[PDB]
Every structure is written in C-alpha cells, then in structure tokens.
Design a binder for these strands. Structure first.
Ligand SMILES: *C(=O)[C@H](Cc1ccccc1)NC(=O)CCCCCN
Ligand SMILES: [Cl-]
Ligand SMILES: [Cl-]
Ligand SMILES: [Cl-]
Ligand SMILES: [Cl-]
Ligand SMILES: [Cl-]
Ligand SMILES: [Cl-]
Ligand SMILES: [Cl-]
Ligand SMILES: [K+]
Ligand SMILES: [Mg+2]
Ligand SMILES: [Mg+2]
Ligand SMILES: [Mg+2]
Ligand SMILES: [Mg+2]
Ligand SMILES: [Mg+2]
Ligand SMILES: [Mg+2]
Ligand SMILES: [Mg+2]
Ligand SMILES: [Mg+2]
Ligand SMILES: [Mg+2]
Ligand SMILES: [Mg+2]
Ligand SMILES: [Mg+2]
Ligand SMILES: [Mg+2]
Ligand SMILES: [Mg+2]
Ligand SMILES: [Mg+2]
Ligand SMILES: [Mg+2]
Ligand SMILES: [Mg+2]
Ligand SMILES: [Mg+2]
Ligand SMILES: [Mg+2]
Ligand SMILES: [Mg+2]
Ligand SMILES: [Mg+2]
Ligand SMILES: [Mg+2]
Ligand SMILES: [Mg+2]
Ligand SMILES: [Mg+2]
Ligand SMILES: [Mg+2]
Ligand SMILES: [Mg+2]
Ligand SMILES: [Mg+2]
Ligand code: NA
Ligand code: NA
Ligand code: NA
Ligand code: NA
Ligand code: NA
Ligand code: NA
Ligand code: NA
Ligand code: NA
Ligand code: NA
Ligand code: NA
Ligand code: NA
Ligand code: NA
Ligand code: NA
Ligand code: NA
Ligand code: NA
Ligand code: NA
Ligand code: NA
Ligand code: NA
Ligand code: NA
Ligand code: NA
Ligand code: NA
Ligand code: NA
Lengths: 142, 132, 156, 172, 337
RNA sequence: AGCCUGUGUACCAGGAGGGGAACAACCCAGAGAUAGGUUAAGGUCCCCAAGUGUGGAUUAAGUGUAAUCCUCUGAAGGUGGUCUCGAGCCCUAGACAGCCGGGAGGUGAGCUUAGAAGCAGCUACCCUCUAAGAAAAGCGUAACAGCUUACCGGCCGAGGUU
RNA sequence: UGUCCCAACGUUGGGCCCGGUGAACUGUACAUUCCAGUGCGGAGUCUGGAGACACCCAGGGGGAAGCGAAGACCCUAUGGA
RNA sequence: CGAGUGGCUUGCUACCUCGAUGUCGGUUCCCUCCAUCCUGCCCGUGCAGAAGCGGGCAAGGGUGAGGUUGUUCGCCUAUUAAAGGAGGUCGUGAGCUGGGUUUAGACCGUCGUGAGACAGGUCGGCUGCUAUCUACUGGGUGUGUAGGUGUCUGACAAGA
RNA sequence: CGCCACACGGGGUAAGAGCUGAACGCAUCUAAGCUCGAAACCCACUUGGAAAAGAGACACCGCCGAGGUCCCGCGUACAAG
C-alpha cells in the first residue's frame, strides 16, 4: 500500500530476466522500483521444459526448507533477489526498495525498459508468468 | 464375498486347532491360511466365522490325517455382533470340511451353526441340524 | 571379453612368434571369397574403409567377414563377384588372468592393426551393388565407424 | 514469400490482429493464425499470406494457413459433411442425438450409455443406420465425426471379431 | 529381506501441537446451490446412547428392519447471528470489508466482546452494496455466537463466537437474506439449517491427553520379546540413518497428543428434537441432564463432553439424503453400570 | 585406476599476488616498503569492475552458457529436424505428384494338368490395332471374376528427381 | 502361558515442580544450520545456494567419522618375554 | 560380433583413518531410486472368449505369514492383486539382540619330532558414558511489526 | 479385541488413440493449431500457518482508563510454563 517508486516498470510482454537485471542494477543505485503486471511478464522457451524447472523448485525442500513462490508475484521478486547480494546490508536495502505487483495499482502506466520487450508477432515459443503460476497450482487472483 | 450380515472379531489364527463339525473322519483341524486374506508385517493371519480357510487334519482317521483340505468356520468362542447390537458366541471353535464347490465333504454336521454362515454357504447350511 | 580391452593401439607391436608361444589359432575362415579363380576384371569395386586406427580381434574379423559374405548370397553360392579381407591379425594380445604382481599376461588371442583410412575389405561386382549392403552389415561388427567407398564406378 | 487467395463472391472475410473470420450463407468461422513473421491480411478482394522468410519451417505454415483459409471459404458456402454408418452384429446399437451430444446405448449390450459432446455449430442428423455430420467449421465437424467413431473404440477384445460401432463412411 | 510396511501414523494432521482455538474453525464451506441459508450451526457435546432405527437404506437387504445405532447426544440450543461480515476479492485473496451489527444483544455477550454502543448499520450496508455494484464482493458470512447459559450442564456463560458462511441463490438475494436474519436479533436454530436424515461435517477439538509417547501418539510397536526386558519398552529403534546426519521431522517422537482440531466428515443427523427424551438415567456421566433443543449424531464426535462442536452441511457426501429416519427406540438406560 | 615402475623438462614440496565458484602443482605471474599509472591471464546482463558493443550467420535443444580435469561423459548405430555447397539427369515440344479417361484384341498363348485362362510348375515370349497396353510387375480366385503396376491421352502449370 | 498376534489398564519407586546439599566427564578457537559441491578421496567453519528473531523447559539419542583407551588385528624394529 | 550404462556382486589399487570411524545377520524407525512384481492407463499377439505371453507410460499406494539354517542368500508350504529389486558408512550397537565370525578353557579329524597349526568341525565364553553443541518432536518467555477485545485472511507448509 | 468417519468430480499431461494440416499438389496424429487420454501432476478435502521484514484485514471498545496480570473456587487443560 503506497510505495513512492522513483520508477514504475511495466513487465507486460517483457523478458523477466532482462527486466530483473535492470531493476536490480537500479535498486543498487538507490532507486525505488515497482514492477507492474507481473502476471503478464514472459520468458522464452519450450513451455514444457520451463514448467518442469519451476515445478522442480516447488518440490525441492526439507525441514530446513526451500520456500519457492508459485504466484507470478513472488516468482518475479525471487528472480530479482537472485541478482542482488540480498544478505549484505546494501543488498537487502536495494531488494527491500523493490516491489512487484499483480496488475497495476498505480495511476501512471509504467514505462517499458529498453531491450526487454518481446514481439509476439515474431515469437511463438514463450510463456506467461501467470500461465506458469496456474500450472504450479496458484490461485488465479488476477 | 457376500455380507455376513454381522460383524466378526476373528477368534482364530494360522496355526489354531479347531473342531471339525462333521462326520468326514477328521476330528481336529489346524488352520493354515485364510482365503482371500492378506495381513500386514508381523501380523498373524486371522480367521473367524464365515471365512473359508485352508486346513490340515491333525486328528482323525489315518486316511484323513495329514491331508490339506478346505473348510468353513461355523463356530467361534469370540463374540460377534448382530444388526440389533446383541453379541453371539459359541461353546467352541469349529469348521466343516468343504470341497471345490463348497459342498460339505461329509454327510452330517455335528453341533449348531451360526445363521450368518447360511448367507454364504448354502449347501453347508442346508445340511445343518441346528441353525442359531 | 569386451573389445574395450584390446581395441587401442597403445601397446608396443607384439608379433615375434620366435619369442611368443601358445598363440591361439585364428578364427578367420578365408580371405579370398567368391570367384577367386577370376581376377579383378569387374566394372565396380567397392571398399570398406576404417575411419580410425584400431585393433580388430580375429573374433570381429570373422564375424564381420561372415556377416558380409554370408549375405553376399543374394547373388548365390557361386555368384559372380570376389570378396577380399586384406588384413591379417598379427598382433598377439595378452590378459593378466598374484594380482598386479608378475602381471605380464598370457597369450589369449590375436588382432589386426588397421589405420584410419585403410580399406579392410574390398569387393568386386558388376553393376549389382548388393555388396554395399553386405558392408552395412560388416562395419556393424567391428569397433570403428566406417566409410563404404566405391572406386571404379561412374555408373550412378 | 507471398500467396494471394481470391475470396469467393459468396463470401466476406474480415480480420483484426491474428484472428480471421469468414462468413457465408452457410455460416461463419473464425480462426487464429499465429506464427513467427507470417502476416495474414484481407486486401479487399483477396486474403494475403506473406513473410520475409523462406526457410522450410515457414513455408510449411504458409501452406497450412492457405488450406485453412480455403477450407473456411468452402465451409461458409458449400459446407462440410461426413457420412457415418452405425453397425452391430448381435446387440442393436441405438444412436440418438440428445442435447448437444450424441448418445449411444446398448453398445455390445452395455447398460451404461456411451456419449460424446458435439463441437461447435456441427449438425449431427441421424436417419436409420446412417449419420451425417455437417457444419462450416471443418475442424469442429471433423472432430465430432471422429469422436463419434472413437466413442465405440474397444481395446479389451479382438476388434476383428467385435466390429460393432459407428464408422466414417464418406470423407468430404 | 525386511518386509515392507506403511509408516506409523498419518503425516497429514500436523504439526501435532495444541490447538489455537478451542472453538473449531472450518476451512471449507458447502457449495452455493439451493436457497440462501447459513451454512452451519453449533452445540455442546453431552454423551452417548443407542437408538433402534428402521433400516432406511434402499440398497440394504435389511431395509425396513430394526437396527441398533450408536448416537452422540449434542445439545443444540438456538444461536444468534449478531452481524453480517462482507469480504472483497483482491490480488491477495479475500479480505474483510465491513460488518453490519445490531443493537439487541444477549445479556452476557460482553463476557467476550466489547459490545458495540455506537455503530452505523446503513453505512456498512451501503459500502457492501457499492462493493457488489463494482463486483468486488467476495462471499458473505455471519458472526455467530452460542448461548451456554441456555445449557445448564455446561459451566460457562461466556459465549463462544464463530463466523459462519452464508451460501444462497444470487449474491444479492443472499446478501438480503443475511441482513434480514441479523436485523431481527440473529436468533436461529438447528431446524432452520439441518433436517434429520441429512449428512453433516462435525468439527471439534479432540480430547487432550497432554504429552504421550510414540507408541500411543503414533502407533509404533513396543519393543518385542527379549528387547522388551533390556531397558527399552516404549522407545523406537532409531532417530534415523547415519546420513542424512539430522533427525527428520517424519520420525515418530513424543509430544502433545490430543486437543487438536478435526473435521469429521459425513456424519448423519439421526434426529433433531427438544426435551429430555434422549437423556440417560442417573444423568450423562460428567455432564448432566438433557432437556431442551438437541441433535442426535450418528456415531462419535471429536472432543469431550461439554466441548463446543460445529456442524456444517456435508461438503463431500457419498450418499443421497434419506430424510427423517424412523426412530423406534431411544435408550435412556443409565450409563453407570 | 586419484595403479605400479622408468625417462626428459617445468613446477608443488619450499612459491606470494591475479584468474579458475571452492582447489599443492592449469592459466598470468616469480615478490623489499609506500605511491601514481598501464597491462597480463581472465572478463564486460545482474550478483561483479567493464558492452544488454558492431557487421553477419547458425541453433529451438535451455542444445549451450563446462580450456585442462578422479572432477567437464556420452558411444557404436540412426535422423525428409534444419541450414549451406557440389554433381548428374528430366522439364512450357508441359516435367514430378495428384485426379479423370484409356489399359485393346489373335488369345482363355503352348506345355503339362480333370483343371490352369498374366500370375502352381516348365518353355517361349511372338504381331495386330494404335496415341497407349507385358505371352504380365503386385494382390486376388478352387480355377474364373474382381483390384491395380507397367505403358498412352487429358486436366493442371513450374520446377523436379537422383 | 502377554514370547508373539497387539497392545491396555493398574501398583510401588523414580522421573516433573519446590527447600536444602552439591560433584564428575569434557572444553584449540569460532559455532542458528540445511542441500549440493570441493578438499589428503567421509566438511557446522572452504565454494554456491537455501534457510535462519533471541532466550528458556521436557524428550528420545540422527550427527559432531560424539566421550572413554598412544589399535589387543596386520605389518615394521638387526624390540621383549 | 560390436557399442555402452550402472556402481548391487567379485576382483584390482593402497589415496584416507592404526594417540581405534565398534563385526556379520536380525530387529526397530525414517527417507529415497526405478532397471515395475501387483494396481491405473496403453501397444502388439502365433489377440474368438476366458486364461496368457511380450512391450510402453508410470514410483501414488501395496509387496504380507510361516518350516530347516546364525545366515545374507537360498530351499520348501499355504495364503495373495502381488507376495519386485536396490541406495542411505554393505542406513540403523552414545537403539536393541549377540546366534555366527574373531581372545583366553576343551574335544575330534588332519598336519608337525615338538611347542603348536588348520575361512575344517564342535561345546563354553563380557556389550561402558549423567548430552556441551548441533538435529528434530512437543512446551514456554521475550523482542520486532506499534493501546485492547473478538472475528478473519492465506504467502506458504504437510498428507496416501 | 469394541464403535463411527475417510469421495466424486473438475484442469493439465505421459504412453497411446485420433482431428485438421504443410513442408513434399498426394500422403502424414505434428512441423504451427486441435480433440482425448494414467492409481501419476494440479485443484478439490483435512491439518498448521501474522515473524509473510510488503511483519496483514475487519468490527467494536479504549487512551484516565479499555483491557490485562496477580488473587480466590475449579477443570472440557496440564511434566514447569
Ligand atoms: C579381525 O577382524 C579382528 C579379530 C580380533 C582381533 C583382536 C582380538 C580379538 C579379535 N577384529 C578387529 O580387528 C576389530 C577391530 C576393531 C576396530 C574398531 N575401531
Ligand atoms: Cl521445504
Ligand atoms: Cl548476499
Ligand atoms: Cl518462436
Ligand atoms: Cl497364510
Ligand atoms: Cl523390538
Ligand atoms: Cl623467483
Ligand atoms: Cl532453463
Ligand atoms: K585403523
Ligand atoms: Mg516378523
Ligand atoms: Mg482376452
Ligand atoms: Mg542387555
Ligand atoms: Mg457405563
Ligand atoms: Mg449393561
Ligand atoms: Mg617438505
Ligand atoms: Mg558494473
Ligand atoms: Mg545441459
Ligand atoms: Mg574435455
Ligand atoms: Mg554458506
Ligand atoms: Mg598405537
Ligand atoms: Mg597377534
Ligand atoms: Mg625372544
Ligand atoms: Mg561413532
Ligand atoms: Mg521407465
Ligand atoms: Mg514415493
Ligand atoms: Mg551397515
Ligand atoms: Mg536396510
Ligand atoms: Mg548409532
Ligand atoms: Mg554399544
Ligand atoms: Mg548410553
Ligand atoms: Mg556368541
Ligand atoms: Mg552355537
Ligand atoms: Mg583362523
Ligand atoms: Mg559357539
Ligand atoms: Mg531488531
Ligand atoms: Na529463458
Ligand atoms: Na520448494
Ligand atoms: Na604370489
Ligand atoms: Na562400428
Ligand atoms: Na539397561
Ligand atoms: Na530391564
Ligand atoms: Na553408527
Ligand atoms: Na620453484
Ligand atoms: Na581462486
Ligand atoms: Na541448460
Ligand atoms: Na504383563
Ligand atoms: Na545424538
Ligand atoms: Na561403467
Ligand atoms: Na585417529
Ligand atoms: Na546389524
Ligand atoms: Na509405485
Ligand atoms: Na526361512
Ligand atoms: Na560404519
Ligand atoms: Na549389529
Ligand atoms: Na552393544
Ligand atoms: Na486426468
Ligand atoms: Na504481525
């Protein structure tokens, strides 16, 4: 609720990894970022294999635990955390100044970062984070 | 199989020595297995009223002795519950030697039989003197 | 025993029968097949070329040869063609069958050393290459990958 | 590459985005035609399928898009029809259309009715031991015909002996 | 060879720790089929007796015949829906929106809540209808409580409060149905929700047994034969293999057993009456005398005598309802002897 | 064999510092202290200093993002998955495929055989009509019939085939 | 005939809480770990990730190749008996 | 005949431990693998049916009781849908057992002049420790979120 | 040892059965698209779960008083707590 984001990024039809890499770099530069429409973010590849990887991550675990997100919400956030030294003071600060959202709770329409957009007209092998979450068992709350 | 129409607490195990309630020449029977039954680790296979059990003859006529035959449990000391909640128990444990078709190998059944055994083995029942 | 044990040419040449005794006989039946009465006076000449230097036990030679010639009876027992296996198993091979003590093994067989690009087999046929098939079956029973090569034959 | 399909006088074909719709006296069929770098557009009197690439995979889809469109043309005018024949040896098989699904009863004596739901605007008119599956959407019709046949599939016993079932008699 | 064998106890009811609320909390509600109606009710366990019934089962070779059936008597006096809570659908699931309270409160509801002295029913109601206009309205439930004072055998007067979902026709129709119930005084009864012969799911916090060993808590064997005389009688063989070198949470160990919540499925409601017809001679041991609104549940119900139990229309029934079974005899014989 | 035992050399042992995720001997590098600068190996999407660099092409498997290696497997064998280069032959005198039509008679050849008629077996395999059509390449029949290959013509229209 | 099927309830002394009395074993350091990898090839501490708010009570002993004993087996010593 | 995969057997090597990492088997209790014995869904058949045989996907669940033997293994009996195999320091002795192996006593056979020897047989022959850390099962006290009562939500976690 | 309760059904797949369909005019279950299809997967159902550091939501009461602890009589609870 209420997040003074210095930047609002729209993930719709963008390559999650390429967005994250840039959101990571900016948060470490002191920027407060908000990723919007996570559910509509995309990742290239053969859906069958992609899903296997994420399903494996869900299954992995033990008493110590391996909490892996299923909602496109966290999936995206965990992706970013993997690009930050989240256990260091600086890293945790940067990570905590970044939040991912389902849809867009803001008024402004986020901006699209360069080199992160995927042309649906010249690409058929890719998937939606939302599709992944539905496969994982998430509750489509979007 | 068909519902006995009564709940049973198996009062017998593999190895139990019971009475042969018929005139086949077999007096004592030793339970070896219970038809259609599979137990669980360390559990002694159990048998009660209305079960078809494989058996061996411990006592009786030389020709009948040592033979491995099939039979049906007709009576057991351990109580059984009937639909109206009443419990029913007998004076001893007994079984009647049967064949492939489940027809008594003998001609006459000695002692009473539980009514429930009828709803399963007709020819055994229709050979009963007393059916409690 | 597996070819894994003797297919490599990493050991010294060991062929001096004047210093080695008890060498098993070869299982290879013949080297000249078909019409050996006639000389290579045929239109077509196909060859099976080994693509890697390897050692081929007389075991595989016999199996490779039989599988090919036995099949070349798509032409008949007295068919018009001649088949040649030009290599001979000169390399004596041992086995250490005590543990690693006094391990010089004892003679257990023989193998032929073939260098990549040599032809092990050579057939001579009239435009009737059933031989090309006799070979798909032959390089099936020898360690290396192989090249089926046709020399005199512009009748494609 | 580029191919041009002159649309039939009897038909009108509109398309926005990756969806093409074809309407004729016999109906309307809308399809999604999505493939990397292949543009499908209605240029007045002709539908155009074109792409800047010519690799095998591309040509394959182009040809596929074409037949898909022509098939739509045909379905909105002449339509598509599959003819089927119910057949039984001992048990009189009863095939009826109830709702949006064809039901089959007494198959090989079965007490439980076997059924299948019809696809789209496909009409399954049954007359005696003859069935006629028809509609403007070849996809839908073709499946409904198939499903009907599949519905009598048997794996348990020798098919050569137990031949009962409904079969596709005439393919369009 | 080592014969196979299922693990000891289920791993689906853990962790096996003490329950947070002695008052059960359903985590599932029936489907919105019939007319609008509160999807649950509550009462207090009293004890057990048996009843003779006429075989109701149409598929039983005994249909129509006498039959002894075990029954747990549960005092089910009326309850009171004191408010209507509204949830809204959001990107993070359902969240409470607002509530519609009343003014008529049971004399002792202040023993648990800080009863409302100033509330705006209409504003709440407005906020809800606007939500519904916008289509963000999530299911509707009623804040409910019991009247223990109505049950003499139960020492407590402090009411037990729980939220129960309202499933009905349309959202608009059941929204209204809710408000109606609440506005009155919320006073409703077992009759209004269940009919004898239907199947219900009963929830409750089991009888507590404090700490117990593996044998009793998980069903592991006792040391056998000679092993039972060496110094170990009720301890498992080992906490695990050498590797992984840690004790896995899956190995049966000592701890809290009992006093856990349990939702026992498909319980048939043999009868819903009022009076002292089901009471036993001498009184229900460690409970008291029954003489008021009651329910006869087939078989057993989790929890001890006096504990609050909850009813809910079966969410996954196996059989079709066979209404109002004929009860030929209810035993009142002393439970002492 | 991260085996045993030689040999030449450089290294570890007794060798820091940079790189290699970690890691005696792999790469750079041999090093007094302090300071500025430029490189080496290696690296430049983030973690992480430096490119989401440029021209072009391939790959759809997450292949791969793995110099060396006990450590990084993947083989014989196979692939109308796809891209590229070459050779031969056929083609607007209409090719390749498909669809339509034709596939005729002497004559169901002779021989054998009750029988045999394209087609059990044996021999032969001739000439007529014609724009084609075997003394029949494959099914089929008890033997016929029937169904098709060869062969010709039409429709079609551009590359095709090895 | 409770050795077993298959375990239950009970008795007494402990155990648990309180007053009083009051040791020993053991301790390079650090230490909330888990999964993998690596390493003299059997890591709480290296590397990568994952998990992890602190303190305390009871428990049964998975790990610390747990504590205890300069291996009693085997070999070696120009050892001993 | 050729090419491989595994790391359960057996062998090789002598890298690790001789200021000790407690043996075999069994037992108890937990997790896992799939090269699937049963069960689900399938393909072929020398598939009429019934009963099978062979193959594919598939590890959710199940795979049990007994007679000889210390046995692992294995042989045998009756049941069974089936009574699969394998990894976890040949899982599991700060858990049990102690039948075998493998101390000191003794006997037999064989070998030796003898002491005495013999994966030959045989009778008898011991099982230590009060948990510091860590791990987990359960139970509390505090702090953080930042006054209280009551009711909820559900990121995730467990299930056969 | 007694008694009660413990689904079905959706969704997506594997093997497999097919549809439409091209590269390759034909053919083709596959290349793009699609219909089905396992005790397996996801949901459903049960249990835990504001320490989820984005550390939550709602209603009412209260900030000089709401509520709570201690206290007393007791257990539907319990080794201390
Ligand atoms: C043979 O395996 C020896 C037998 C033996 C040796 C000495 C005395 C009596 C029996 N057994 C052992 O060497 C066991 C060693 C135990 C080492 C444990 N760390
Ligand atoms: Cl986990
Ligand atoms: Cl970090
Ligand atoms: Cl693509
Ligand atoms: Cl048995
Ligand atoms: Cl035990
Ligand atoms: Cl130097
Ligand atoms: Cl990947
Ligand atoms: K040692
Ligand atoms: Mg046992
Ligand atoms: Mg059959
Ligand atoms: Mg003892
Ligand atoms: Mg009583
Ligand atoms: Mg009585
Ligand atoms: Mg040195
Ligand atoms: Mg940088
Ligand atoms: Mg890879
Ligand atoms: Mg390499
Ligand atoms: Mg770490
Ligand atoms: Mg020593
Ligand atoms: Mg000694
Ligand atoms: Mg001496
Ligand atoms: Mg130890
Ligand atoms: Mg498999
Ligand atoms: Mg499993
Ligand atoms: Mg072991
Ligand atoms: Mg084991
Ligand atoms: Mg241990
Ligand atoms: Mg010990
Ligand atoms: Mg101890
Ligand atoms: Mg002993
Ligand atoms: Mg002994
Ligand atoms: Mg010895
Ligand atoms: Mg002994
Ligand atoms: Mg703090
Ligand atoms: Na990707
Ligand atoms: Na996980
Ligand atoms: Na020797
Ligand atoms: Na080869
Ligand atoms: Na003891
Ligand atoms: Na004892
Ligand atoms: Na151990
Ligand atoms: Na040096
Ligand atoms: Na380094
Ligand atoms: Na990869
Ligand atoms: Na006892
Ligand atoms: Na321990
Ligand atoms: Na191997
Ligand atoms: Na040591
Ligand atoms: Na053991
Ligand atoms: Na399984
Ligand atoms: Na045995
Ligand atoms: Na060990
Ligand atoms: Na042991
Ligand atoms: Na011991
Ligand atoms: Na399914
Ligand atoms: Na909180």
């Amino acid at each position: 609720a209420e997040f003074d984001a210095d930047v609002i990024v729209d993930a719709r039809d963008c390559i999650m990894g390429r967005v994250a890499s840039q959101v990571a770099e900016q948060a470490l530069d002191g920027e407060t970022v908000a990723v919007v429409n996570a559910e509509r973010a995309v990742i290239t590849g053969r859906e069958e294999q992609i899903v296997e990887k994420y399903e494996k991550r869900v299954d992995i675990g033990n008493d110590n635990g391996y909490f892996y997100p299923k909602r496109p919400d966290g999936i995206f956030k965990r992706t970013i955390r993997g690009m930050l030294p989240h256990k260091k003071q600086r890293g945790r600060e940067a990570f905590e100044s970044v939040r991912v959202y389902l849809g867009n709770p803001y008024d402004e329409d986020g901006e699209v970062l360069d080199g992160t957009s995927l042309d649906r007209l010249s690409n058929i092998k890719f998937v939606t984070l939302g599709e992944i979450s539905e496969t994982l068992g998430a509750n489509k709350t979007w | 199989m068909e519902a006995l129409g009564a709940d049973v607490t198996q009062g017998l195990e593999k190895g139990s020595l019971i009475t042969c309630a018929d005139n086949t020449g077999a007096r004592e029977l030793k339970v070896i297995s219970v038809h259609g039954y599979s137990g669980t680790k360390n559990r002694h296979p159990k048998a009660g009223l209305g079960d078809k059990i494989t058996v061996s003859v411990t006592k009786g006529t030389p020709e009948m002795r040592r033979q491995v035959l099939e039979a049906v449990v007709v009576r057991q000391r351990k109580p059984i519950r009937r639909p109206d909640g009443t419990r029913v128990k007998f004076e001893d444990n007994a079984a009647v030697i049967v064949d492939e078709n489940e027809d008594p190998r003998g001609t006459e059944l000695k002692g009473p039989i539980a009514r429930e055994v009828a709803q399963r083995f007709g020819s055994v029942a229709s050979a009963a003197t007393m059916i409690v | 025993k597996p070819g894994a044990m003797y297919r490599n040419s990493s050991k010294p040449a060991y062929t001096r029968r004047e210093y080695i005794s008890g060498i098993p006989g070869k299982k290879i039946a013949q080297f000249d097949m078909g019409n050996n009465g006639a000389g290579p006076t045929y239109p077509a000449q196909v060859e099976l070329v080994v693509e890697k230097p390897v050692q081929i036990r007389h075991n595989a030679l016999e199996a490779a040869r039989v599988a090919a010639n036995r099949y070349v009876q798509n032409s008949g027992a007295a068919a018009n063609y001649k088949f040649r296996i030009r290599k001979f198993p000169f390399h004596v091979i041992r086995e250490n069958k005590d543990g690693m003590r006094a391990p010089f093994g004892k003679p257990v067989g023989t193998a032929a050393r073939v260098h990549g690009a040599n032809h092990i087999f050579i057939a001579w046929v009239n435009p009737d290459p059933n031989v090309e098939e006799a070979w798909r079956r032959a390089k099936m029973k020898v360690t290396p990958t192989i090249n089926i090569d046709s020399s005199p034959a512009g009748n494609a | 590459p580029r191919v041009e399909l002159e649309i039939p006088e009897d038909v009108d074909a509109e398309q926005d985005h990756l969806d093409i719709t074809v309407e004729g006296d016999n109906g309307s069929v809308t399809r999604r035609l999505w493939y990397p770098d292949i543009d499908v557009s209605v240029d007045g009197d002709t539908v155009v399928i074109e792409s800047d690439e010519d690799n095998a995979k591309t040509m394959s889809t182009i040809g596929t898009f074409q037949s898909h469109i022509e098939n739509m043309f045909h379905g909105v005018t002449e339509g598509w029809e599959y003819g089927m024949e119910v057949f039984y040896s001992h048990f009189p098989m009863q095939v009826n259309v109830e709702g949006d699904e064809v039901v089959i009863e007494n198959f090989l004596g079965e007490k439980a009715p076997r059924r299948t739901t019809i696809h789209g605007d496909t009409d399954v008119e049954i007359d005696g031991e003859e069935l006629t599956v028809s509609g403007p959407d070849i996809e839908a019709v073709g499946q409904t015909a198939a499903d009907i046949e599949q519905l009598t599939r048997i794996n348990d016993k020798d098919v050569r002996v137990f031949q009962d079932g409904v079969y596709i008699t005439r393919k369009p | 060879p080592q014969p196979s064998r299922p693990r000891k106890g289920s791993l689906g009811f853990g962790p096996r720790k003490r329950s947070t609320s002695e008052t059960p909390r359903f985590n599932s509600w029936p489907s919105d089929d019939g007319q609008p109606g509160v999807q649950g009710f509550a009462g207090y366990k009293a004890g057990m007796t048996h009843v003779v019934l006429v075989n109701d089962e149409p598929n039983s070779p005994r249909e129509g015949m006498e039959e002894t059936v075990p029954v747990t008597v549960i005092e089910t006096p009326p309850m009171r829906a004191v408010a209507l809570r509204a949830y809204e659908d959001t990107p993070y699931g359902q969240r409470p929106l607002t509530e519609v309270w009343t003014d008529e409160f049971h004399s002792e509801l202040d023993r648990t809540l800080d009863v409302p002295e100033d509330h705006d029913p209409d504003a709440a109601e407005e906020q809800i209808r606007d939500a519904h206009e916008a289509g963000d309205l999530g299911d509707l439930r009623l804040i409910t409580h019991t009247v223990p004072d109505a049950v003499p055998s139960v020492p407590k007067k402090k009411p037990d409060v729980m939220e129960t979902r309202v499933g009905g026709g349309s959202v608009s129709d059941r929204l209204d149905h809710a408000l109606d119930i609440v506005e009155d005084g919320g006073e409703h009864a077992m009759n209004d929700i269940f009919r004898a012969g239907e199947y219900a799911d009963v929830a409750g916090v089991t009888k507590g047994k404090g700490t117990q060993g593996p044998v009793k808590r998980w069903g592991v064997q006792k040391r056998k034969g000679k092993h039972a005389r060496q110094g170990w009688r009720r301890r498992i063989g080992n906490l695990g293999p050498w590797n992984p070198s840690r004790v896995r949470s899956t190995v049966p160990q000592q701890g809290q057993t009992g006093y856990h919540q349990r939702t026992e499925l498909n319980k048939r409601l043999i009868d819903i009456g009022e009076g002292d017809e089901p009471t036993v001679d001498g009184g229900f041991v460690n409970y008291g005398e029954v003489d008021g609104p009651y329910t006869l549940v087939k078989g057993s119900v989790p929890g001890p005598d006096k504990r609050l139990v909850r009813f809910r229309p079966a969410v996954r029934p196996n059989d079709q309802p066979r209404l109002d079974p004929e009860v030929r005899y209810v035993s009142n014989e002393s439970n002492q002897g």
